[PDB]
Amino acid sequence: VKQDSLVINLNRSNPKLKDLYIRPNIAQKRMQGSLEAHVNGFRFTSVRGDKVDILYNNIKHALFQPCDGEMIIVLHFHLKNAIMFGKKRHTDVQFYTEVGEITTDLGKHQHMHDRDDLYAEQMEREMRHKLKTAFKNFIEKVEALTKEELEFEVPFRDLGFNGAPYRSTCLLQPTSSALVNATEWPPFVVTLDEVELIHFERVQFHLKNFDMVIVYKDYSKKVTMINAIPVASLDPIKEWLNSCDLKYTEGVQSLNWTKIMKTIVDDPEGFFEQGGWSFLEESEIEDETFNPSEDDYEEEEEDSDED
Amino acid sequence: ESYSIYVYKVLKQVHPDTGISSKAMGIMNSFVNDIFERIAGEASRLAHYNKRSTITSREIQTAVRLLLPGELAKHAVSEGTKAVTKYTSS
Amino acid sequence: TRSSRAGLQFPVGRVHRLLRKGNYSERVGAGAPVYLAAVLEYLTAEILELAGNAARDNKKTRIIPRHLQLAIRNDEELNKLLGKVTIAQG
Amino acid sequence: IQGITKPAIRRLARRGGVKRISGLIYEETRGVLKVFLENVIRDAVTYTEHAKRKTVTAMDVVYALKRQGRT
Amino acid sequence: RDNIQGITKPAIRRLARRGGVKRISGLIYEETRGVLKVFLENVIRDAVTYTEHAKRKTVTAMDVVYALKRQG
Amino acid sequence: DGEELIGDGMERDYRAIPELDAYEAEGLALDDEDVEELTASQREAAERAMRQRDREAGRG
Amino acid sequence: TELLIRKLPFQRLVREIAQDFKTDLRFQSSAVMALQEACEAYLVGLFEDTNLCAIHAKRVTIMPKDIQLARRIRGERA
Amino acid sequence: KSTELLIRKLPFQRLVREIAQDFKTDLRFQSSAVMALQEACEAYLVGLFEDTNLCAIHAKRVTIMPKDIQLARRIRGE
Numbered sequence A: 001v002k003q004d005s006l007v008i009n010l011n012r013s014n015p016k017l018k019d020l021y022i023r024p025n026i027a028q029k030r031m032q033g034s035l036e037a038h039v040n041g042f043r044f045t046s047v048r049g050d051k052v053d054i055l056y057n058n059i060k061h062a063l064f065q066p067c068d069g070e071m072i073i074v075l076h077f078h079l080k081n082a083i084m085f086g087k088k089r090h091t092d093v094q095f096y097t098e099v100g101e102i103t104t105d106l107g108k109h110q111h112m113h114d115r116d117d118l119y120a121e122q123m124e125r126e127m128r129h130k131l132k133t134a135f136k137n138f139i140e141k142v143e144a145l146t147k148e149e150l151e152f153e154v155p156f157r158d159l160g161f162n163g164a165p166y167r168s169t170c171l172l173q174p175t176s177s178a179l180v181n182a183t184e185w186p187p188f189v190v191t192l193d194e195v196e197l198i199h200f201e202r203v204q205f206h207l208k209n210f211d212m213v214i215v216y217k218d219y220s221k222k223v224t225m226i227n228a229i230p231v232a233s234l235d236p237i238k239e240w241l242n243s244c245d246l247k248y249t250e251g252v253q254s255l256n257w258t259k260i261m262k263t264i265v266d267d268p269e270g271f272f273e274q275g276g277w278s279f280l281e282e283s284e285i286e287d288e289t290f291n292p293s294e295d296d297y298e299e300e301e302e303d304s305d306e307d
Numbered sequence B: 001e002s003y004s005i006y007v008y009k010v011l012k013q014v015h016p017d018t019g020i021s022s023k024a025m026g027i028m029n030s031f032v033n034d035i036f037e038r039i040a041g042e043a044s045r046l047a048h049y050n051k052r053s054t055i056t057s058r059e060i061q062t063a064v065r066l067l068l069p070g071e072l073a074k075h076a077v078s079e080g081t082k083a084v085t086k087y088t089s090s
Numbered sequence C: 001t002r003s004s005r006a007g008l009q010f011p012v013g014r015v016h017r018l019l020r021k022g023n024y025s026e027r028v029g030a031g032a033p034v035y036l037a038a039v040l041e042y043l044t045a046e047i048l049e050l051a052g053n054a055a056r057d058n059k060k061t062r063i064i065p066r067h068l069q070l071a072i073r074n075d076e077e078l079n080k081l082l083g084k085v086t087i088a089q090g
Numbered sequence D: 001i002q003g004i005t006k007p008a009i010r011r012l013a014r015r016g017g018v019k020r021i022s023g024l025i026y027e028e029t030r031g032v033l034k035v036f037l038e039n040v041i042r043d044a045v046t047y048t049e050h051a052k053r054k055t056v057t058a059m060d061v062v063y064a065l066k067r068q069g070r071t
Numbered sequence E: 001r002d003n004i005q006g007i008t009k010p011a012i013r014r015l016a017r018r019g020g021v022k023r024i025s026g027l028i029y030e031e032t033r034g035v036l037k038v039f040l041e042n043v044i045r046d047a048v049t050y051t052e053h054a055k056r057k058t059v060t061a062m063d064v065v066y067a068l069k070r071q072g
Numbered sequence F: 001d002g003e004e005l006i007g008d009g010m011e012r013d014y015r016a017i018p019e020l021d022a023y024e025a026e027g028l029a030l031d032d033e034d035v036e037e038l039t040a041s042q043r044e045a046a047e048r049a050m051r052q053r054d055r056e057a058g059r060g
Numbered sequence G: 001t002e003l004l005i006r007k008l009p010f011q012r013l014v015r016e017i018a019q020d021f022k023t024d025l026r027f028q029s030s031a032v033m034a035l036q037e038a039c040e041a042y043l044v045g046l047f048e049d050t051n052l053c054a055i056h057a058k059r060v061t062i063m064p065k066d067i068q069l070a071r072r073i074r075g076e077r078a
Numbered sequence H: 001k002s003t004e005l006l007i008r009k010l011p012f013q014r015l016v017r018e019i020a021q022d023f024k025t026d027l028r029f030q031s032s033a034v035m036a037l038q039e040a041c042e043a044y045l046v047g048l049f050e051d052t053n054l055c056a057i058h059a060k061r062v063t064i065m066p067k068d069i070q071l072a073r074r075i076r077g078e
Helices: A112-116 A121-145 A231-241 A257-266 A268-273 B004-014 B022-049 B057-067 B070-087 C002-006 C012-021 C032-057 C065-073 C076-082 D006-015 D025-050 D058-066 E009-018 E028-052 E061-071 F040-056 G007-019 G029-056 G064-074 H009-023 H031-058 H066-076
Strands: A016-023 A032-037 A041-046 A052-055 A059-065 A072-085 A088-098 A161-163 A170-174 A178-181 A188-191 A195-201 A209-216 A224-230 A247-250
Touching (some): A016 A041, A032 A121, A059 A178, A059 A188, A072 A121, A161 A231, A209 A231, A224 A231, A224 G029, A257 A268, B004 B022, B022 C032, B022 C065, B057 C032, B057 E028, B070 C002, C002 C012, C032 C065, D006 D025, D006 G029, D025 G029, D025 G064, D058 G029, E009 H031, E028 H009, E028 H031, E028 H066, E061 H031, G007 G029, G029 G064, G029 H031, G029 H066, G064 H031, H009 H031, H031 H066
Parallel strands (some): A195 A247
Antiparallel strands (some): A016 A088, A032 A041, A041 A052, A072 A088, A161 A170, A161 A224, A170 A178, A195 A209, A209 A224
């Protein structure tokens, strides 16, 4: 798919911020660089000179995830059309900056100076402050430059949930017009206004978690199955499901979605001719009701236990 | 044995128009038996913790406050205290 | 008729006799059965309230096992208390 | 003798949300089933033996289950 | 923040040195503090109940061990 | 590499077959027979000895 | 009704494993149903933990290593 | 009886006061009580760290991460 050539303005100084590791890696070695905002798109550069062109209209959702509560701050971009650079074709491209954590040194050669009480958490907090202030300035400046053509989105981390949609378990965070998790690369992105209904699978007597099915308004795309969402996130998701107000239903059986979408694609008329999405909703014979005339004859047998 | 009648009476107390199926009724008997045995085992252990040869209502209050979470513990010791102040009123 | 003196439907005397029948301790007190029947009636009334409300939101009169499951599921203080149980069908 | 139908194990996997199993899990599942069965049946048969009779009742089963924490 | 946040990092790394713990990352500190507060509240509830129903205001070690063996 | 459970083939394992979805009456107590459960002392003594030999772990 | 493991093979295995330890038993129908249901519930719980462990290791395939890890973290080894 | 130099006593007793103010104010503890508390806390933490390292090394990684912590909690039931 074609793209648009990026243009540079030397008349005035443009936005700039360095220390962004690109993801995914262009060469197999992980790589760091800098990022600049221009008239028609973002120009990402590095010490090798990788010219990453991210067109503004090519950004569907601008994602940002901060550095308080997570060791890495992420600026994620979802493109309308995937672009090829470094002989690799990518659709989601993020740039992340770290704060600094120890990863080893647990007594095999651990120095005594952890007991020196440096109080380095204050320096860590100031570094967090500097990063978040710089990122705030960058976001406001690019809001000014874009003429409000596109808008970034920051997730609801406080009322998020734990979910395992991919091969790896993670925590999913709703946003204003998307549900995204770019922390665990490969990043997971979905847009809220594109999903017709949500079906929950494996709801029963107390289980640790459940599966959940995301069914799109189109049908040539497979439904997205997010597994491993705890019971503690069951209704809170519903508290968010009524925010953008999208329909949700539950079920116990895991469904054959391959055949569902095949039956949808081959003959679309017959599916709505039978009611549509009407598969989301004897017993006395199978379960006797208590007879309200069976009683214990024995009474006043309490006896006396004295003072 | 079967404590179905008292459960039917409290059912009439809170929602009189309701009833209950016999399977759910036996499950109710099993649940009440189990929770009674748990609190009774706790009380029999406390009959040896605090060294008293007898079991007073303080021990049952302790068992309720231990086996139950925050809200239910207080909301049950309330009913316990009301009934014991009713019995102490002759 | 000490159950009328206690003020609640549960058989306080029957509770006392089944407590001393289990041979848990040497002496059994005069006030423990009253408090025990009190907390038992409170919990029975609360769970019957939950089951009746679930049956009303399900548009049925009787409460079945599924109503009890859906009632304790929408209660963190019964899931964190008696979420470790086993009942499926009969 | 290890008489558990394989589709029963498949249904168990489906109720747990499992997606891709290998051709080796069946023996492990049968072994763990036997592991749990031997202990619970030992508890139940001991309860029936101290009851001074030879009948196994559901009350024995629930008493055996009570020790672990499942009622 | 709270009145005070909790225990220090080298204490946690010594706890780790006592386990088979290898390759500690920089996030386990806060989660350890949170789970410590959760479990401490769960046990101190029972401890203070045991001391209050032992008709005294002094919390001895015996109440502590009673709570630990009740939780199991 | 492995098997599959989502897609085709799941519904075959749920097929209702009467000779397998039923029980059998071998070594089964008649419903007409009356049976009495344990007393308190019997079950307490049984479980005390059982915990003692669980620390023992004699069989094996 | 669509249910889980069929009653007859489980009851036969239970009888075999029960006659391994004691002979000449009298069973109740409710007792066998309780055994089957409790085993099924515990197995679903352990299967759920096993899927969580297999998912944690970045693998879509489940293997007995996940089973043993879940069993040991529960504390069920001896 | 070897659980000593892990935890400094001063933050320990400060945290005990912070948790005691919530439920019952103005209770008193003996020193033996505090030592028993510390011993039990370090025991549970070292056991959970052992389980966490088990899960982390199970992830084909040698590094311990909060996902291993939450997985161990959720199998344990915290």
